[PDB]
Design a protein around this ligand. Structure first.
Ligand code: HEA
Ligand code: HEA
Ligand SMILES: CCCCCCCCCCO[C@@H]1O[C@H](CO)[C@@H](O[C@H]2O[C@H](CO)[C@@H](O)[C@H](O)[C@H]2O)[C@H](O)[C@H]1O
Ligand SMILES: CCCCCCCCCCO[C@@H]1O[C@H](CO)[C@@H](O[C@H]2O[C@H](CO)[C@@H](O)[C@H](O)[C@H]2O)[C@H](O)[C@H]1O
Ligand SMILES: CCCCCCCCCCO[C@@H]1O[C@H](CO)[C@@H](O[C@H]2O[C@H](CO)[C@@H](O)[C@H](O)[C@H]2O)[C@H](O)[C@H]1O
Ligand SMILES: CCCCCCCCCCO[C@@H]1O[C@H](CO)[C@@H](O[C@H]2O[C@H](CO)[C@@H](O)[C@H](O)[C@H]2O)[C@H](O)[C@H]1O
Ligand SMILES: CCCCCCCCCCO[C@@H]1O[C@H](CO)[C@@H](O[C@H]2O[C@H](CO)[C@@H](O)[C@H](O)[C@H]2O)[C@H](O)[C@H]1O
Ligand SMILES: CCCCCCCCCCO[C@@H]1O[C@H](CO)[C@@H](O[C@H]2O[C@H](CO)[C@@H](O)[C@H](O)[C@H]2O)[C@H](O)[C@H]1O
Ligand SMILES: CCCCCCCCCCCCC
Ligand SMILES: CCCCCCCCCCCCC
Ligand SMILES: CCCCCCCCCCCCC
Ligand SMILES: CCCCCCCCCCCCC
Ligand SMILES: CCCCCCCCCCCCC
Ligand SMILES: CCCCCCCCCCCCC
Ligand SMILES: [Ca+2]
Ligand SMILES: [Cu+]
Ligand SMILES: [Cu+]
Ligand SMILES: [Cu+]
Ligand SMILES: [Mg+2]
Lengths: 535, 256
């Protein structure tokens, strides 16, 4: 049965990515639960230096039960390790593998009428590089790291000199993990682009390609430019750490800010790489359940292309307090505001698609509508942040954390859930139970809002990012945020229950198209699941 | 001195303003907040209306349109107009922030793992500033009876734990303070929310910020770039005082 892992079929590779992204997602979400346990109340109660004296297993277990402050020596290194771990897993080993590696590999060839990807053996290799990258990232958490403990306490973006002076080799492992992720993504992108250009079915013209396939195509191009730049940035960290270079060390004439320019040159595209496939999925879902063709097909394609392109010229909005000149700050502010227009516009198109439709509120549609709301709430705080004068106050506070969890983290996640409920019958031959779909949606929707909305208040009140502990006054909204996270976690465990139920005993799917005629792309003309060899 | 620059329990707004730059931030944010709350309510009411009005039970046959030129014109221009209006108010504020005026008082701040060093080059005064409760003051970064005792002795209370430092940066009211910020080891970030200022403390670079404090009191900030194990434990206390009290403070540091 472990002939799953040696398969080169785009459908099998897609399923492997979805399950793996899901499992890594579970691990990273569990890190957020522990994080929110410690942030639930001021004073440190869980992350005690005393737990280090115990074994690896025994220490782990004591750390899940609160201690009195008087018996708990605060261990800031563990906080920093956990949040670094949370961030890296999500940005490299969860959502892109799920969306691009998972749904991208499964569905893009189906959508364009291609039998398989241009280079199936390379596709299989991309999966194994993802797995190897994940393995190294996780290994780094248990490798000798900063402050004579395990793991790297350095932030998902690895700013030097902190990243370059962190002791042990945990950080070098993290850097190798990111190289492997980049390689996986680049192979994926090469496959996606080659297939999309060369292997469309006869009659499948550029203007007839479904929006999801377009979203994967644009995403693939962002990856080819962004990921090699990141490869440079982190290799330069690796050489500062191990091979005597001083790219980012002032003693040798280096500039730590140089790293930031290079990192964020990857870093901004990265967030659009995350969200573009979600845009694709939202378009398919809304068109289906509104029973109405997508409003402005060509503007949707062009908006995506434009966003993709402009996403390469805004990076320094992540650097407004880093020591940028007034001219630089002003330019990046204007460039950021411009890209806001096509991005924010797409919300109007999705609403226009619903408008005058015949709307069914099945689970996938609920996720899509949740996406529109959360992406809007997140997008508008982006507008606030773009204004450098106001970012002066918000930068490196929880207001930014609230922003990107709304716009990016929940955007991607609601996109993922929309896809899973939309397509699980197609992929598996079994249908999810509708009442459980909806219960998942409402628990998650309420949970996510309780988690992140109060973080805007923490940020306005000046709570910094990356803090194990905080002044008493921040207690109320931290407590509410943590209750939200615990409810979101419950909803995710319920989801995993729903998926287990669906795949083992869900109602048999009998129809090729178990939705309606307005799901009008090619996968809905095939059986459920599709034939081994399609087209 | 009144404790002014601090978070308050259950707060949802900004910390109080104590500079003209902070006031400008509060106004600009308040202006953008109205717009974005309107946009968000608008989008939300549209979604909810569309779902009610065009539910499959209420609208049985779906329309097929994919264009509406007047609407697509309007919904493109309006966002462009909104952003220009914001930029028009926002850029002058940015210019006011980043154009460093002539200093009445000059302080050079250096971030270290994990404390701040302050130097007043005109006064030949220099000192380090540690969290009350850090290992420097005999603690291990948590509340304890000893820590509460030290807070009280320094003129604070239990409530200022994590904010209060053993020594403060002291400046006179209604004077232009220019702060030169750098880092010694890794990147730190120096900030006071009540003044509307924040500047990364980057090794190898000296960057400047300014503020003019418009009232006397105590104002706190916290290190705003992750810098390792005690990032959460290296805050900033600024004491804004009368010209005379500032002079008195200076003379106390003068060696005869
Ligand atoms: C999905 C990914 C995603 C998206 C789409 C966005 C969208 C936007 N982002 Fe966000 N951003 C992130 C992911 C994303 N961001 C991440 C991960 C970070 C920080 C990472 C880290 O530090 O760890 C970040 C941080 C970040 C910063 C730096 C903050 C700081 O660290 O101090 C800034 C500053 O400009 C910014 C701005 C914007 C803007 C203006 C938009 C706009 O494009 C949004 C467009 C606006 C909307 C969608 C609103 C709805 C609009 C309409 C309905 C109609 C249009 C109306 C108008 C334009 C008025 N973002
Ligand atoms: C996609 C990206 C993503 C996602 C999904 C999340 C999810 C969550 N994040 Fe994360 N977060 C980041 C990206 C993300 N985060 C990043 C990059 C940082 C910065 C790290 C740094 O400082 O360096 C950060 C930082 C960060 C902080 C601030 C840490 C600090 O400054 O000290 C907090 C605080 O509460 C937090 C909380 C949460 C919570 C409670 C959740 C969730 O529990 C919310 C509830 C959501 C769910 C329960 C759904 C989970 C579903 C999936 C993940 C899909 C899995 C795949 C399949 C099913 C196929 N995150
Ligand atoms: C399916 C979802 C599963 C998610 C898991 C959720 C786990 C919930 C853990 C709650 O435990 C609480 O933790 C607090 C610590 O934050 C303690 O605070 C109390 O005790 C502390 C000392 O331990 C004091 O310092 C605090 O001030 C005092 O309020 C409190 O007693 C304890 O009940
Ligand atoms: C944690 C997130 C999980 C995401 C859910 C993914 C659902 C896809 C499962 C599909 O599995 C398929 O099942 C078919 C028969 O059942 C097989 O024949 C087919 O080869 C296999 O591909
Ligand atoms: C670890 C996290 C824990 C998460 C919390 C889990 C809470 C689950 C509640 C279970 O209650 C369920 O409610 C459903 C809804 O009422 C019932 O379906 C029933 O009702 C539906 C009505 O819409 C019908 O469609 C179904 O056929 C019918 O079985 C179902 O039997 C019942 O067990
Ligand atoms: C951490 C784990 C958390 C728990 C996760 C579990 C989530 C999945 C539970 C699905 O629940 C099933 O839903 C079916 C679909 O609604 C019900 O079929 C019921 O309704 C059908 C449709 O009317 C009938 O034909 C069936 O006979 C009748 O049993 C069935 O009873 C119920 O058990
Ligand atoms: C900024 C916020 C925007 C959020 C989006 C929600 C608004 C969407 C409203 C769409 O308006 C409809 O557009 C149709 C197409 O333009 C018009 O059909 C007209 O034109 C069609 C041909 O395209 C004909 O079939 C119809 O009979 C004729 O009424 C129709 O009157 C009009 O109500
Ligand atoms: O365009 C720019 O707009 C600025 C306005 O946003 C002008 O700044 C001018 O106006 C600002 C208004 O507060 C002042 O802070 C500046 O000193 C002054 O140079 C500046 O010249 C001009 O090139
Ligand atoms: C006085 C002690 C209060 C007991 C609360 C214990 C918290 C249990 C947390 C365990 C959850 C694991 C994820
Ligand atoms: C099928 C009827 C279900 C009850 C109505 C639910 C309203 C759906 C609103 C979801 C939008 C979330 C922003
Ligand atoms: C806290 C989540 C609210 C539960 C709503 C469930 C609606 C039933 C479908
Ligand atoms: C005072 C507003 C409360 C908001 C709760 C978070 C949603
Ligand atoms: C639509 C996103 C809004 C996020 C910002 C919420 C802040 C509101 C608090 C205002 C209270 C000031 C006194
Ligand atoms: C006054 C200049 C504003 C520019 C806004 C960019 C769109
Ligand atoms: Ca705590
Ligand atoms: Cu960005
Ligand atoms: Cu620091
Ligand atoms: Cu710091
Ligand atoms: Mg920063």
């Amino acid at each position: 049965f472990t002939r799953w892992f040696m398969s080169t079929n785009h459908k099998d590779i897609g399923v492997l990515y979805l399950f793996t992204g899901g499992l890594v997602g579970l691990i990273s979400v569990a890190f957020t639960v522990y994080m929110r346990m410690e942030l639930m109340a001021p004073g440190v109660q869980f992350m005690c230096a005393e737990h280090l004296e115990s074994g690896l297993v025994k220490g782990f277990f004591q750390s899940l039960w609160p201690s009195a402050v008087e018996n708990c020596t605060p261990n800031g290194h563990l906080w920093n390790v956990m949040i670094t771990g949370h961030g890296i897993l999500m940005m490299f080993f969860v959502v892109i593998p799920a969306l691009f590696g998972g749904f991208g590999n499964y569905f893009m060839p189906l959508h364009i009428g291609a039998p398989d990807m241009a280079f199936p053996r390379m596709n299989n290799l991309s999966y194994w590089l993802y797995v190897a990258g994940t393995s190294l990232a996780v290994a780094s958490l248990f490798a000798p790291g900063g402050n004579g403990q395990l793991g790297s306490g350095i932030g998902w973006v690895l700013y030097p000199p902190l990243s370059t002076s962190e002791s042990g080799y945990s950080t070098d492992l993290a850097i190798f993990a990111v190289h492997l992720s980049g390689a996986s993504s680049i192979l994926g992108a090469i496959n996606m682009i080659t297939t999309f250009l060369n292997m469309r079915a006869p009659g499948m013209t550029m203007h007839k390609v479904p929006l999801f396939a377009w979203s994967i195509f644009v995403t693939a191009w962002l990856i080819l430019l962004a990921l090699p730049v990141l490869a440079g940035a982190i290799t330069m960290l690796l050489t500062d750490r191990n091979f005597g270079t001083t790219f980012f060390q002032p003693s040798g004439g280096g500039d730590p800010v140089l790293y930031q320019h290079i990192l964020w040159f990857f870093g901004h595209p990265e967030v659009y790489i995350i969200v573009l496939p979600a845009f694709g999925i939202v378009s398919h879902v809304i068109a289906t359940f509104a029973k109405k063709p997508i409003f402005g097909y060509l503007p949707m394609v062009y908006a995506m292309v434009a966003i993709g392109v402009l996403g390469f010229v805004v990076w320094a909005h992540h650097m407004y307090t880093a020591g940028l000149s007034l001219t630089q700050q002003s330019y990046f502010m204007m460039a950021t505001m411009v890209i806001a227009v096509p991005t924010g516009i797409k919300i109007f198109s999705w609403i226009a698609t619903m408008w005058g439709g015949s709307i069914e509120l099945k689970t996938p549609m609920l996720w899509a509508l949740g996406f529109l709301f959360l992406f809007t709430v997140g997008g508008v705080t982006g507008i606030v942040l773009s204004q450098a004068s106001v970012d002066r106050y918000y930068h490196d506070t929880y207001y930014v954390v609230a922003h990107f969890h709304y716009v990016m983290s929940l955007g991607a996640v609601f996109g993922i859930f929309a896809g899973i409920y939309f397509w699980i019958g197609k992929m598996s031959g079994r249908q999810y139970p509708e009442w459980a779909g909806k219960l998942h949606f409402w628990m998650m929707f309420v949970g996510a809002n309780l988690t992140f909305f109060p973080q805007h208040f923490l940020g306005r009140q000046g709570m910094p990012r990356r803090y194990i502990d905080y002044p008493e006054a921040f207690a109320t909204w931290n407590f509410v945020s943590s209750l939200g996270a615990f409810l979101s976690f419950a909803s995710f465990l319920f989801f995993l229950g729903v998926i287990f139920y669906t795949l083992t005993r869900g109602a048999r799917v009998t129809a090729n198209n178990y939705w309606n005629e307005h799901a009008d792309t090619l996968e809905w003309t095939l059986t459920s699941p599709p034939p081994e060899h399609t087209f | 001195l009144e404790i002014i620059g601090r978070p308050q329990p259950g707060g949802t707004g900004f910390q109080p303003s104590a500079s003209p730059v902070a006031t400008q931030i509060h106004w600009l944010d308040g202006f953008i907040l109205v717009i974005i709350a309107a946009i968000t309510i608008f989008v939300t009411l549209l979604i909810l209306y569309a779902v009610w009005r065009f539910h499959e039970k209420r609208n049985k046959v779906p329309a097929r349109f994919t264009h509406n030129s007047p609407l697509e014109i309007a919904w493109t221009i309006v966002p462009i107009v909104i952003l220009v209006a914001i930029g028009a108010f926002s850029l002058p504020v940015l210019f006011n922030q980043q154009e460093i005026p002539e200093a009445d008082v000059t302080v050079k701040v250096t971030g270290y793992q994990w404390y701040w060093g302050y130097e007043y080059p005109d006064e030949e005064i220099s000192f380090e500033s540690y969290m009350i409760g850090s290992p420097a003051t005999g603690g291990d970064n948590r509340m304890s009876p000893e820590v509460e005792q030290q807070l009280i002795e320094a003129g604070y209370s239990r409530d200022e734990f994590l904010l209060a430092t053993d020594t403060a940066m002291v400046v006179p009211v209604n004077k232009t303070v220019v702060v030169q910020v750098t880092g010694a080891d890794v990147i730190h970030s120096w900030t006071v929310p009540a003044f509307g200022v924040k500047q990364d403390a980057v090794p190898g670079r000296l960057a400047q910020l300014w503020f003019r404090a418009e009232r006397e009191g105590i104002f706190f900030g916290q290190c705003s770039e992750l810098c390792g194990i005690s990032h959460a434990y290296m805050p900033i206390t600024v004491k804004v005082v009368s010209e005379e009290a500032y002079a008195a403070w200076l003379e106390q540091h003068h060696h005869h």
